[PDB]
Design an enzyme around this catalytic site. Structure first.
Site, PDB file in Angstrom:
ATOM      1  N   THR A  16      50.409  32.019 -23.326  1.00  0.00           N
ATOM      2  CA  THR A  16      51.576  32.878 -23.148  1.00  0.00           C
ATOM      3  C   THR A  16      51.241  34.363 -23.251  1.00  0.00           C
ATOM      4  O   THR A  16      52.147  35.193 -23.107  1.00  0.00           O
ATOM      5  CB  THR A  16      52.670  32.526 -24.163  1.00  0.00           C
ATOM      6  OG1 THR A  16      52.100  32.488 -25.475  1.00  0.00           O
ATOM      7  CG2 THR A  16      53.295  31.165 -23.849  1.00  0.00           C
ATOM      8  N   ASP A  39      36.874  24.700   3.124  1.00  0.00           N
ATOM      9  CA  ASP A  39      36.159  25.955   2.907  1.00  0.00           C
ATOM     10  C   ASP A  39      34.793  25.934   3.579  1.00  0.00           C
ATOM     11  O   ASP A  39      34.632  25.307   4.637  1.00  0.00           O
ATOM     12  CB  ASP A  39      36.083  26.230   1.399  1.00  0.00           C
ATOM     13  CG  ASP A  39      36.128  27.697   1.060  1.00  0.00           C
ATOM     14  OD1 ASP A  39      35.132  28.387   1.365  1.00  0.00           O
ATOM     15  OD2 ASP A  39      37.127  28.161   0.481  1.00  0.00           O
ATOM     16  N   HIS A  69      31.026  30.578  -1.127  1.00  0.00           N
ATOM     17  CA  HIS A  69      32.465  30.723  -1.339  1.00  0.00           C
ATOM     18  C   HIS A  69      33.121  29.387  -1.693  1.00  0.00           C
ATOM     19  O   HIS A  69      33.876  29.294  -2.671  1.00  0.00           O
ATOM     20  CB  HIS A  69      33.072  31.354  -0.081  1.00  0.00           C
ATOM     21  CG  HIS A  69      34.534  31.665  -0.158  1.00  0.00           C
ATOM     22  ND1 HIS A  69      35.498  30.767   0.242  1.00  0.00           N
ATOM     23  CD2 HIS A  69      35.192  32.802  -0.489  1.00  0.00           C
ATOM     24  CE1 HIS A  69      36.691  31.326   0.133  1.00  0.00           C
ATOM     25  NE2 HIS A  69      36.533  32.557  -0.317  1.00  0.00           N
ATOM     26  N   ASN A 161      44.141  39.064   1.164  1.00  0.00           N
ATOM     27  CA  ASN A 161      43.559  40.173   0.411  1.00  0.00           C
ATOM     28  C   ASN A 161      43.778  41.523   1.080  1.00  0.00           C
ATOM     29  O   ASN A 161      42.916  42.399   1.015  1.00  0.00           O
ATOM     30  CB  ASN A 161      42.062  39.961   0.195  1.00  0.00           C
ATOM     31  CG  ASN A 161      41.745  38.664  -0.521  1.00  0.00           C
ATOM     32  OD1 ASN A 161      42.526  38.181  -1.337  1.00  0.00           O
ATOM     33  ND2 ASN A 161      40.584  38.094  -0.220  1.00  0.00           N
ATOM     34  N   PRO A 175      56.379  28.257   4.719  1.00  0.00           N
ATOM     35  CA  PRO A 175      57.267  28.132   3.552  1.00  0.00           C
ATOM     36  C   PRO A 175      57.027  26.898   2.706  1.00  0.00           C
ATOM     37  O   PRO A 175      57.238  26.962   1.487  1.00  0.00           O
ATOM     38  CB  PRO A 175      58.673  28.141   4.170  1.00  0.00           C
ATOM     39  CG  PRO A 175      58.498  28.833   5.481  1.00  0.00           C
ATOM     40  CD  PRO A 175      57.134  28.441   5.969  1.00  0.00           C
ATOM     41  N   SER A 224      41.356  34.050  -2.843  1.00  0.00           N
ATOM     42  CA  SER A 224      40.562  32.826  -2.763  1.00  0.00           C
ATOM     43  C   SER A 224      40.242  32.257  -4.133  1.00  0.00           C
ATOM     44  O   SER A 224      39.980  31.060  -4.244  1.00  0.00           O
ATOM     45  CB  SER A 224      39.231  33.096  -2.070  1.00  0.00           C
ATOM     46  OG  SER A 224      39.391  33.287  -0.682  1.00  0.00           O
ATOM     47  N   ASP A 260      55.796  38.785 -16.568  1.00  0.00           N
ATOM     48  CA  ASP A 260      54.720  39.350 -17.372  1.00  0.00           C
ATOM     49  C   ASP A 260      53.711  40.164 -16.571  1.00  0.00           C
ATOM     50  O   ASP A 260      52.861  40.830 -17.174  1.00  0.00           O
ATOM     51  CB  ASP A 260      54.002  38.251 -18.167  1.00  0.00           C
ATOM     52  CG  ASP A 260      54.906  37.597 -19.198  1.00  0.00           C
ATOM     53  OD1 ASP A 260      55.722  38.311 -19.818  1.00  0.00           O
ATOM     54  OD2 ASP A 260      54.799  36.370 -19.397  1.00  0.00           O
TER      55      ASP A 260
END
Length: 279
Positions: A16, A39, A69, A161, A175, A224, A260
């Site tokens: 938290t 990937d 990657h 990115n 969606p 990623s 947060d």
């Protein structure tokens, strides 16, 4: 269970609060689930995967990860040290070449492959797919991601990115899948992270330590890197019986740490993936 001196992102997803370094999780650890990493491949021989990773499909001359990657993303899903779901089964689907590039037609084929191939695997707790890839908007790419999700796979995709609205990128803009933005260790939106109403969740994405090719490790950044945190989290929660492939994105949003993160644009969710594990 507790893993001390864990990568910050693992600690973050079981906390938290930012600023801790122990990862807490139920020892079931995603056992009985499966995660496909779509990937550049996975270096399945890496000691970190403990025999739980395997390549199942490639569209190129080799199934080996000549980039790193895909191995890094797979490590965040399920490696022993760097992974969220430390006992899941990992299946690699190499849709990207060793430069990290792939045609949309190949990527679409790889998604439809997973939707069928899961019927060839033993995944009694459920199936997840992690897609740390994307490009410009394509209705066909979005439709493929939607099919994969509809087939009974929890699809997690990178937001991208570009520090831009993810509505203009695919499969981020679909969606019905879980679109993942990136945060840093101080609970700030990562500088490069896409945003917008199509995002469902944020995960750790800046300075993420994980596996690399050559039996190595390194820290890199991107949406990623955030995506496999969410994919591993889904597998972990499905093994616990708390959610299903069709409902896991919504469950993760329901149970997220809320409000947060800093630098979240108005209209983008302020939700950070959280496992809600009580020791």
């Amino acid at each position: 269970a507790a893993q001390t001196n864990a990568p910050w992102g693992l600690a973050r997803i079981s906390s938290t609060s930012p600023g801790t370094s122990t990862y807490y999780y139920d020892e079931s650890a995603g056992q009985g689930s499966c995660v496909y990493v779509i990937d550049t491949g996975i270096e399945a021989s890496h000691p970190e995967f403990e025999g739980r990773a395997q390549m199942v499909k490639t569209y190129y001359y080799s199934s080996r990860d000549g980039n790193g990657h895909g191995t890094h993303c797979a490590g965040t899903v399920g490696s022993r040290t760097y992974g969220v779901a430390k006992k899941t089964q990992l299946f690699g689907v190499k849709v990207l070449d060793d430069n990290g590039s792939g045609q949309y037609s190949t990527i679409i084929a790889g998604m439809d492959f997973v939707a069928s191939d899961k019927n060839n695997r033993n995944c009694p707790k459920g199936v997840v797919a992690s897609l740390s890839l994307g490009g410009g908007y394509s209705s066909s790419v979005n439709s493929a991601a939607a099919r994969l999700q509809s087939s009974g796979v929890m699809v997690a995709v990178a937001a991208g990115n570009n520090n831009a609205d993810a509505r203009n990128y695919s499969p981020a803009s679909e969606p019905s899948v879980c679109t993942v933005g990136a945060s840093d260790r101080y609970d700030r939106r990562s500088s490069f992270s896409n945003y917008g109403s199509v995002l469902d969740i944020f995960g750790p994405g800046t300075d993420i330590l994980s596996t690399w090719i050559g039996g190595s490790t390194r820290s890199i950044s991107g949406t990623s890197m955030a995506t496999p945190h969410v994919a591993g989290l889904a597998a972990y929660l499905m093994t616990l019986g708390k959610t299903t492939a069709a409902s896991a994105c919504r469950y993760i949003a329901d149970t997220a740490n809320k409000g947060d993160l800093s630098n979240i644009p108005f209209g983008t969710v302020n939700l950070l993936a959280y496992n809600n594990y009580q020791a």
